[PDB]
Amino acid sequence: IVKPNGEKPDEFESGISQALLELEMNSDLKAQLRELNITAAKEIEVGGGRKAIIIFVPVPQLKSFQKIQVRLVRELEKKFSGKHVVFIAQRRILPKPTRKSRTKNKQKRPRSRTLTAVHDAILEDLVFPSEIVGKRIRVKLDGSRLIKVHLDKAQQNNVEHKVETFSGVYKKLTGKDVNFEFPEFQ
Amino acid sequence: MQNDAGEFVDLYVPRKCSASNRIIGAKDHASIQMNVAEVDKVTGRFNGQFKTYAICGAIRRMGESDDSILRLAKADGIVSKN
Amino acid sequence: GRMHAPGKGLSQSALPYRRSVPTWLKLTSDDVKEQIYKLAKKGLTPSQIGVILRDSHGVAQVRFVTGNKILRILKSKGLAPDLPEDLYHLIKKAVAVRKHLERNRKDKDAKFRLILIESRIHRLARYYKTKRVLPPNWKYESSTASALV
Amino acid sequence: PLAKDLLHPSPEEEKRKHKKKRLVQSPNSYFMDVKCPGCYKITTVFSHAQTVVLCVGCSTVLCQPTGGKARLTEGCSFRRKQ
Amino acid sequence: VRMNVLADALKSINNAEKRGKRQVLIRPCSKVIVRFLTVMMKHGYIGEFEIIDDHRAGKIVVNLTGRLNKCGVISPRFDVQLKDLEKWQNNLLPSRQFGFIVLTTSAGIMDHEEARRKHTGGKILGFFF
Amino acid sequence: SGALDVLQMKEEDVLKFLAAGTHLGGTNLDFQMEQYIYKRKSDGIYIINLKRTWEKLLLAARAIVAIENPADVSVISSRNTGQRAVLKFAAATGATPIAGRFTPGTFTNQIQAAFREPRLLVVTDPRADHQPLTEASYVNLPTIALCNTDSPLRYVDIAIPCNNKGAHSVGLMWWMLAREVLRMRGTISREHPWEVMPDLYFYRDPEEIEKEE
RNA sequence: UAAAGUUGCUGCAGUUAAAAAGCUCGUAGUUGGAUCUCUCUCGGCCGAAGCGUUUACUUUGAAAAAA
Incomplete structure (x- = not known):
């Protein structure tokens, strides 16, 4: 039932589709899953031998997915053993227009579809239940950035385990190193 | 200080302030070179060795020589952390 | 500092870092838009609409809830004033001081303040004509100022 | 000072500063839920409200505008969020 | 302002x-x-x-x-050619052993030594030594 | 201290500090002494954090011990409050005391009878001993001072936060400095209390000496 | 002409030595905050064809008399 973007679903993507189908036919959230849909799914190693799976939801359904994501992620976690689950919207990036190019688009690139905006949105969507209360880009002596993200204290014990998988997912998608912290000052 | 042959050609290497990393001039008579005695971990007695902090006269005049020496001692374990 | 006064004030709002809808806001975007339309139909400017929504119903920022600014929402449905609100208020102040100066010709401070107000009006009108918010031939005149208010 | 840390300021030292002069600016205002004896619904009131807030369940004013924070009438319980 | x-x-x-x-x-x-x-x-x-x-x-x-010792800006950002770079270094730098002029070139923002390595002139941003 | 358990401050030291009123500063606060105070009371008096006081006293004792010749340490007190304490410190430790008027040019005028070139310089009050502190900036002379809340920290390299106004506090501070210097040197141990009591350093005004006898 | 950093773009000066308009608006001028990483033809890397939003740069390559 998944609507793929590469026109050929993978075995893991079909497995996640079957899990969502089972949650649709028999679960506590069957009323809202009807119009919901995902576009892709991948699994990657976040460190050592641990794995986490990324679900790419279409953007217009992102809010609908999030209002039930807290419920959905627990079921998908108990279903797939020790593999962490994240929901990140399928956001496309249009390249920066250059004077060496052709008629790519007669109208201006939207600012929500640039690389920096899409990466900020990916970071925001990586931690849905916990909001971002701050950001500090550290530039080390060798000139390599390290982003340090501040999250809510009221979501500390609930999400601190999900860290080291947020960083791995962000490194896989965007290539940027990110750390997560929970400042004492509110 | 080093020519292309690698030989050192400076008259001398002047001290740098332990706080500001600025050169202490040869005629800076307000600068100090304080020695802080090192102490045994179980007896608390002088070890015969010490730690040296050089503070220039500009820091002394502006009054931050005390805070600079305090921070240098803290960052060295002579003064207890917190 | 101020454009027409020697003052250098630091008073202005400090928007919070979090751009999210507050947890206490059970009002969805469409209810906010409906209340905006009702307040505009009552004859209120976007500034007053925002003040009322922040004060009584409780909306940190309309932009964080509906995704659009108040004036953009009004223009989208179509309820916005023909001329911009700040320009309208400047013209209103100019009309007030001009009416005062008629019976107070000895008030030479009022004349100076009126000159400053009309300079502000001319600058704002030039900016609005640059951005096509005003017609290219839109002119402010004393004999026609009260016709715009 | 000469070594004051700006990246990790004390929370009291940041509540002390002007809201605009902080490391990341944040308002000094807040929203409160005010309960009135004459009603039951939720009335969220801005702390610095510029309008006269009226409880829809009675002829009682909730707050009065002031140069700074609004003046809440005696007999109303207000709970601050965030 | x-x-x-x-x-x-x-x-x-x-x-x-x-x-x-x-x-x-x-x-x-x-x-x-x-x-x-x-x-x-x-x-x-x-x-x-x-x-x-x-x-x-x-x-x-x-x-x-x-x-x-000193970091400064050059205003306006004069366009500097690779043949006029030496004059700028003599005007701005304490010596030929240390000190850098920061240019902005189509190859990016870099110092004058790199700009000569990449054979690019640009616009002078500032200097530091 | 170095966080060593051996160099930690004991209950007896805190008892002496509280009895002497060392923790009680003044109503004014020098901006360089803010890191040493704890709070300000309802009567405006700043409370000096005794942890920081003990830390700075031990640092000063280390600095004094590092001076190989004890005579190269100079102890200064122009006020009578710290004079007898300075003489007692010099007698116990071996430093060279200057009690009373400090003659200008003592450190800078080589053609002078009372010319000395100390390697360290300890004063009871930077505001009251400003002349030796100023001259210490001419001869590369590091300085240790007993500083109150309003004491200025110019030319002061180790400021010991303490009440330098009261006679009891000044005497106790000098006595503890001497005791710590001796303990760090090796003479007298820290396992049993020192035989010299702090009151040997306290200043006695003529009314007090007449009343006591 | 240099000396003249006594015409100062580099690079002067304007409290008291010569000097900031009595004051404030104001058009031209000058300057201006953050922010964007079967489109195409002979053989499954080639000339053509380019509105990439014109530019300003920068770096090339021609054309710029001799003396």
């Missing part, structure tokens, strides 16, 4: 280095400010710095190693 935020950043760094401070807070931040600071830091003059993200225009807290 505040024009040329790079001038403000460099003046703040210079003033904090004269006062002997270990950290300076620069605001507002900008891409050119970050590139200039990175060029400074690659040469060991300034050390690590952190970009504070407020949602309007960042601030930067810059650690200060006591190695910096």
Whole structure:
């Protein structure tokens, strides 16, 4: 039932589709899953031998997915053993227009579809239940950035385990190193 | 200080302030070179060795020589952390 | 500092870092838009609409809830004033001081303040004509100022 | 000072500063839920409200505008969020 | 009003280095400010710095190693050709052994030595030594 | 101290500090002494954090011990409050005391009878001993001072936060400095209390000496 | 002409030595905050064809008399 973007679903993507189908036919959230849909799914190693799976939801359904994501992620976690689950919207990036190019688009690139905006949105969507209360880009002596993200204290014990998988997912998608912290000052 | 042959050609290497990393001039008579005695971990007695902090006269005049020496001692374990 | 006064004030709002809808806001975007339309139909400017929504119903920022600014929402449905609100208020102040100066010709401070107000009006009108918010031939005149208010 | 840390300021030292002069600016205002004896619904009131807030369940004013924070009438319980 | 935020950043760094401070807070931040600071830091003059993200225009807290004598901006940003670079270095640098002129070229923001290595002239941003 | 359990401050030291009123500063606060105070009371008096006081006293004792010749340490007190304490410190430790008027040019005028070139310089009050502190900036002379909340820190390299106004506090501070210097040197141990009691350093005004006898 | 950093773009000066308009608006001028990483033809890397939003740069390559 998944609507793929590469026109050929993978075995893991079909497995996640079957899990969502089972949650649709028999679960506590069957009323809202009807119009919901995902576009892709991948699994990657976040460190050592641990794995986490990324679900790419279409953007217009992102809010609908999030209002039930807290419920959905627990079921998908108990279903797939020790593999962490994240929901990140399928956001496309249009390249920066250059004077060496052709008629790519007669109208201006939207600012929500640039690389920096899409990466900020990916970071925001990586931690849905916990909001971002701050950001500090550290530039080390060798000139390599390290982003340090501040999250809510009221979501500390609930999400601190999900860290080291947020960083791995962000490194896989965007290539940027990110750390997560929970400042004492509110 | 080093020519292309690698030989050192400076008259001398002047001290740098332990706080500001600025050169202490040869005629800076307000600068100090304080020695802080090192102490045994179980007896608390002088070890015969010490730690040296050089503070220039500009820091002394502006009054931050005390805070600079305090921070240098803290960052060295002579003064207890917190 | 101020454009027409020697003052250098630091008073202005400090928007919070979090751009999210507050947890206490059970009002969805469409209810906010409906209340905006009702307040505009009552004859209120976007500034007053925002003040009322922040004060009584409780909306940190309309932009964080509906995704659009108040004036953009009004223009989208179509309820916005023909001329911009700040320009309208400047013209209103100019009309007030001009009416005062008629019976107070000895008030030479009022004349100076009126000159400053009309300079502000001319600058704002030039900016609005640059951005096509005003017609290219839109002119402010004393004999026609009260016709715009 | 000469070594004051700006990246990790004390929370009291940041509540002390002007809201605009902080490391990341944040308002000094807040929203409160005010309960009135004459009603039951939720009335969220801005702390610095510029309008006269009226409880829809009675002829009682909730707050009065002031140069700074609004003046809440005696007999109303207000709970601050965030 | 505040024009040329790079001038403000460099003046703040210079003033904090004269006062002997270990950290300076620069605001507002900008891409050119970050590139200039990175060029400074690659040469060991300034050390690590952190970009504070407020949602309007960042601030930067810059650690200060006591190695910096002067950092300055050149206003206006004169277009500099590779044949006029030596005159600029004689005008701006204390000696031919140390000190850098930071140019902005189509190959990016870099010092004058790199600009001569890449055979690019550009627009002069500033200098530091 | 170095966080060593051997160099930690004991209950007896805190008892002496509280009895002497060392923790009680003044109503004014020098901006360089803010890191040493704890709070300000309802009567405006700043409370000096005794942890920081003990830390700075031990640092000063280390600095004094590092001076190989004890005579190269100079102890100064122009006020009578710290004079007898300075003489007692010099007698116990071996430093060279200057009690009373400090003759200008003592450190800078080589053609002078009372010319000395100390390697360290300890004063009871930077505001009251400003002349030796100023001259210490001419001869590369590091300085240790007993500083109150309003004491100025120019030319002061180790400021010991303490009440330098009261006679009891000044005497106790000098006595503890001497005791710590001796303990760090090796003479007298820290396992049993020192035989010299702090009151040997306290200043006695003529009314007090007449009343006591 | 240099000396003249006594015409100062580099690079002067304007509290008291010569000097900031009595003051404030104001058009031209000058300057201006953050922010964007079967489109195409002979053989499954080639000339053509380019509105990439014109530019300003920068770096090339021609054309710029001799003396």
